[PDB]
Ligand binder design. Sequence first.
Ligand SMILES: *[C@@H]1O[C@H](CO)[C@@H](O[C@@H]2O[C@H](CO)[C@@H](O)[C@H](O)[C@H]2NC(C)=O)[C@H](O)[C@H]1NC(C)=O
Ligand SMILES: *[C@@H]1O[C@H](CO)[C@@H](O[C@@H]2O[C@H](CO)[C@@H](O)[C@H](O)[C@H]2NC(C)=O)[C@H](O)[C@H]1NC(C)=O
Ligand SMILES: *[C@@H]1O[C@H](CO)[C@@H](O[C@@H]2O[C@H](CO)[C@@H](O)[C@H](O)[C@H]2NC(C)=O)[C@H](O)[C@H]1NC(C)=O
Ligand SMILES: *[C@@H]1O[C@H](CO)[C@@H](O[C@@H]2O[C@H](CO)[C@@H](O)[C@H](O)[C@H]2NC(C)=O)[C@H](O)[C@H]1NC(C)=O
Ligand SMILES: *[C@@H]1O[C@H](CO)[C@@H](O[C@@H]2O[C@H](CO)[C@@H](O)[C@H](O)[C@H]2NC(C)=O)[C@H](O)[C@H]1NC(C)=O
Ligand SMILES: *[C@@H]1O[C@H](CO)[C@@H](O[C@@H]2O[C@H](CO)[C@@H](O)[C@H](O)[C@H]2NC(C)=O)[C@H](O)[C@H]1NC(C)=O
Ligand SMILES: *[C@@H]1O[C@H](CO)[C@@H](O[C@@H]2O[C@H](CO)[C@@H](O)[C@H](O)[C@H]2NC(C)=O)[C@H](O)[C@H]1NC(C)=O
Ligand SMILES: *[C@@H]1O[C@H](CO)[C@@H](O)[C@H](O)[C@H]1NC(C)=O
Ligand SMILES: *[C@@H]1O[C@H](CO)[C@@H](O)[C@H](O)[C@H]1NC(C)=O
Ligand SMILES: *[C@@H]1O[C@H](CO)[C@@H](O)[C@H](O)[C@H]1NC(C)=O
Ligand SMILES: *[C@@H]1O[C@H](CO)[C@@H](O)[C@H](O)[C@H]1NC(C)=O
Lengths: 318, 225, 31, 162
Amino acid sequence: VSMTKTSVDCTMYICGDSTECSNLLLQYGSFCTQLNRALTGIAVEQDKNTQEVFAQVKQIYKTPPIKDFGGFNFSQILPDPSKPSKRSFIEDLLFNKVTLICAQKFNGLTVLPPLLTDEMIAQYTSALLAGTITSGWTFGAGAALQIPFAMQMAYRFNGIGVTQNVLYENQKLIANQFNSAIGKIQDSLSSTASALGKLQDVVNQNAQALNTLVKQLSSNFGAISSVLNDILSRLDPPEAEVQIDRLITGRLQSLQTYVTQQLIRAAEIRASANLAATKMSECVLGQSKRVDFCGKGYHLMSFPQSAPHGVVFLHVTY
Amino acid sequence: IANQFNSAIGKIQDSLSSTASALGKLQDVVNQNAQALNTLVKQLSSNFGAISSVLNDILSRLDPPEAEVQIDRLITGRLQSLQTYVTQQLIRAAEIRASANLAATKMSECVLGQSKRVDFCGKGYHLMSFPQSAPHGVVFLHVTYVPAQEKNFTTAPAICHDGKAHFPREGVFVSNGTHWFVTQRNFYEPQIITTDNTFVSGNCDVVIGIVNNTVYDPLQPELDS
Amino acid sequence: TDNTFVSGNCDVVIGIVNNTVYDPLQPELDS
Amino acid sequence: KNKCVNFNFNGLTGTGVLTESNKKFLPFQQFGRDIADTTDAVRDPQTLEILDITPCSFGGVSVITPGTNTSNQVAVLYQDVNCTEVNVFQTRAGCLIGAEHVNNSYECDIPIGAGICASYQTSQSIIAYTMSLGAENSVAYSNNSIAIPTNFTISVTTEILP
Ligand SMILES: *[C@@H]1O[C@H](CO)[C@@H](O[C@@H]2O[C@H](CO)[C@@H](O)[C@H](O)[C@H]2NC(C)=O)[C@H](O)[C@H]1NC(C)=O
Ligand SMILES: *[C@@H]1O[C@H](CO)[C@@H](O[C@@H]2O[C@H](CO)[C@@H](O)[C@H](O)[C@H]2NC(C)=O)[C@H](O)[C@H]1NC(C)=O
Ligand SMILES: *[C@@H]1O[C@H](CO)[C@@H](O[C@@H]2O[C@H](CO)[C@@H](O)[C@H](O)[C@H]2NC(C)=O)[C@H](O)[C@H]1NC(C)=O
Ligand SMILES: *[C@@H]1O[C@H](CO)[C@@H](O[C@@H]2O[C@H](CO)[C@@H](O)[C@H](O)[C@H]2NC(C)=O)[C@H](O)[C@H]1NC(C)=O
Ligand SMILES: *[C@@H]1O[C@H](CO)[C@@H](O[C@@H]2O[C@H](CO)[C@@H](O)[C@H](O)[C@H]2NC(C)=O)[C@H](O)[C@H]1NC(C)=O
Ligand SMILES: *[C@@H]1O[C@H](CO)[C@@H](O[C@@H]2O[C@H](CO)[C@@H](O)[C@H](O)[C@H]2NC(C)=O)[C@H](O)[C@H]1NC(C)=O
Ligand SMILES: *[C@@H]1O[C@H](CO)[C@@H](O[C@@H]2O[C@H](CO)[C@@H](O)[C@H](O)[C@H]2NC(C)=O)[C@H](O)[C@H]1NC(C)=O
Ligand SMILES: *[C@@H]1O[C@H](CO)[C@@H](O)[C@H](O)[C@H]1NC(C)=O
Ligand SMILES: *[C@@H]1O[C@H](CO)[C@@H](O)[C@H](O)[C@H]1NC(C)=O
Ligand SMILES: *[C@@H]1O[C@H](CO)[C@@H](O)[C@H](O)[C@H]1NC(C)=O
Ligand SMILES: *[C@@H]1O[C@H](CO)[C@@H](O)[C@H](O)[C@H]1NC(C)=O
């Protein structure tokens, strides 16, 4: 959903600590100003993605002090107030399995923090999870309406064709089927780390692009040296402007290549962010009569889970 | 519904005329293009390392073989400006085409048809959508069903009458403290429990939460005829 | 009869079989 | 040490902040470098010491102001740095001056970051407050308790797509 926000300064990156080099950069006009506005718009859209996805409601729904789950065990999906940061037992594993930046952000680029902190993003999921357990299907389309969870699985069978008489008779057997399904996910994410690799690839995609842009400063780009001050010392000021122009042109191509990828990768994330905004709407909030949109099986109700630079969906299927 | 719907249409006409920031979604698309067009034009005033940004100035000063060296500096900077513009326009169009697919999807599902998917056509249960022409885009007016007034009701998953559980064919069970009623989920309409609105499945010893009650049978009063 | 509806006849639909459909109105009249 | 200076060491030059760390170079290695081959630390040509090189303080200047039709009040924001240059307050995103920290959280107006939003309110200025996620709603839950709508409202929502 959210992609790492990075604002690269084309004043410092192109010309490190050099005024005369910056005079050569001013010869190219708005190229610096334009590349900054492109990365700025990315940082704004990534903040708009979290608002259009994570928060589907304008109210914070919380669980009552007396927790009646209808036989299921929701302690895994529901947050724990005992921890210093509010998160579910599953999201605690989601933060650990997804993990230098300090060295590169001192090179003249800036990694911007997200507008919504992980504690606030978890409260969005806490509002959606506590709502579906209590308000169920109502709160997505309007004001929250309290409904017993024992009856919140009854109409969901009526939507997939199963007569709701199966629920109330098999509710004891479904309690074992659902609780075992949640337990297998916790063991899958904790033991196997390749399930969250979709988010790790996004972080690795950014970290590789960030490392790619920084490693280009050591390149010659056709110039005699890769250091601006070294060229000014070894060559005359007019003769250095020719060598510096090769560095600036090569470093601009480094930004134009990085900014191009970031604009393309952002559209890739926004394509998945629109799906996350659509899935939370159809899967989490309501019931999906569609097939295999919420995953394999007849969809019933979905559980959103906060994750770094994304979101994890738990889809209860029949 | 007439007072609710007809006033809701007027609220939008009052919101669009008085508040101009509601259309900022489309205003940003036009501004995104203007900022891309203006940036592309302002590059011709930049020297790009050349002595001047005017072709007639370079051709009139340096030799034809000397001008090609400086003109090479302009075109290289002007290609990088034009390629960057085309790069963004291809990316900006991908944003517009992705929204056009949603516009084509909502036009069929929201406007043309009826979408059961929640909050795809907007907050509320979708009824119908009204398309409106807008510059470089489209404005959708979605008629939705939003519940307003509610009240705490005593509910049970089942009704125990003859020793067999009774389940609603459509709706849920509610009670106002007098008699158990069968009402719609989105609307409260007290109705006497009858064999036509319920179906017999299982017994009273299985379902958790079943309550004892009497189901009206229309065949019994007709026995006198 | 509460779970079924009468449409057409037995001489059209392919695959129709002969059976006895329970009618709850019958035992109530005699009892 | 511990200041922004232009240093020239042996045949190496640069600009940054010199700080002695716990790193230990090999006796035959005078200069260290990072992943990018940019020098993160040096050894003094005279005295034997390990001086980590941290670049000078820099960041983005984020101007937070209401529209020209509202007011000329401005809250300057610095990124990834404490207050150095410089109602001088500090935030999670960095040093934020011109805005007043408020414990009461309201609806987000001007986005900043790290869950912080700014607005122009009350003798009125710009305030920096924690972004509110919406009004807390505790929905009662019970086995026999249910909420069935007794009345509805038809609302027409306006969706705008290019
Ligand atoms: C739901 O699962 C949790 C798992 O932590 C249960 O909590 C504990 O589970 C362990 C076994 O893994 C027991 O030994 C403990 O006695 C349980 N209680 C505590 C306080 O740790 C929890 O009891 C299960 N049931 C519900 C409804 O939460
Ligand atoms: C349900 O709510 C609607 C409003 O959403 C009520 O309609 C209003 O009723 C009052 C009664 O005095 C009138 O003064 C208002 O002018 C009505 N407004 C509209 C938009 O018509 C309605 O009365 C409520 N009750 C029912 C049964 O619908
Ligand atoms: C709850 O619903 C019942 C059934 O609709 C209400 O009972 C009716 O009340 C009205 C007004 O007092 C009487 O005129 C009817 O004859 C009653 N019908 C029956 C069959 O009892 C009851 O008043 C409602 N409110 C309460 C107190 O539960
Ligand atoms: C609903 O009615 C049933 C009987 O049809 C009640 O179950 C009986 O409970 C008594 C003790 O109170 C036993 O002596 C009977 O043998 C039970 N009968 C059956 C059919 O098991 C049941 O308790 C009633 N429930 C309520 C809430 O009134
Ligand atoms: C149902 O059984 C009848 C025989 O009892 C099958 O054939 C019918 O026989 C009667 C005479 O007894 C004829 O008048 C009918 O024209 C025959 N055909 C039908 C369909 O009525 C009949 O084929 C059996 N139907 C099925 C589908 O099992
Ligand atoms: C019953 O309806 C009320 C309508 O407000 C629900 O709201 C509760 O109202 C009581 C009034 O004393 C408050 O004390 C509760 O704190 C309110 N709860 C919430 C979360 O708003 C109430 O939840 C409904 N259910 C009950 C328990 O009667
Ligand atoms: C749903 O039913 C259960 C069981 O009757 C309720 O839990 C009881 O609550 C009372 C009153 O505080 C206690 O005396 C009991 O020990 C509880 N019994 C069990 C089995 O837990 C529960 O309170 C009801 N619904 C809610 C959410 O309150
Ligand atoms: C160099 O001169 C300084 C003067 O203080 C002395 O301390 C040091 O031991 C000499 N040798 C080295 C290591 O440069
Ligand atoms: C500023 O905006 C307000 C609200 O739209 C308006 O009433 C006022 O006339 C505007 N003032 C100017 C100078 O435009
Ligand atoms: C800012 O102050 C905090 C708290 O004293 C300190 O931990 C941190 O190192 C400081 N950062 C900077 C950039 O000075
Ligand atoms: C916020 O709370 C702190 C700690 O209690 C207090 O020192 C401070 O005066 C409060 N500020 C405001 C604006 O209420």
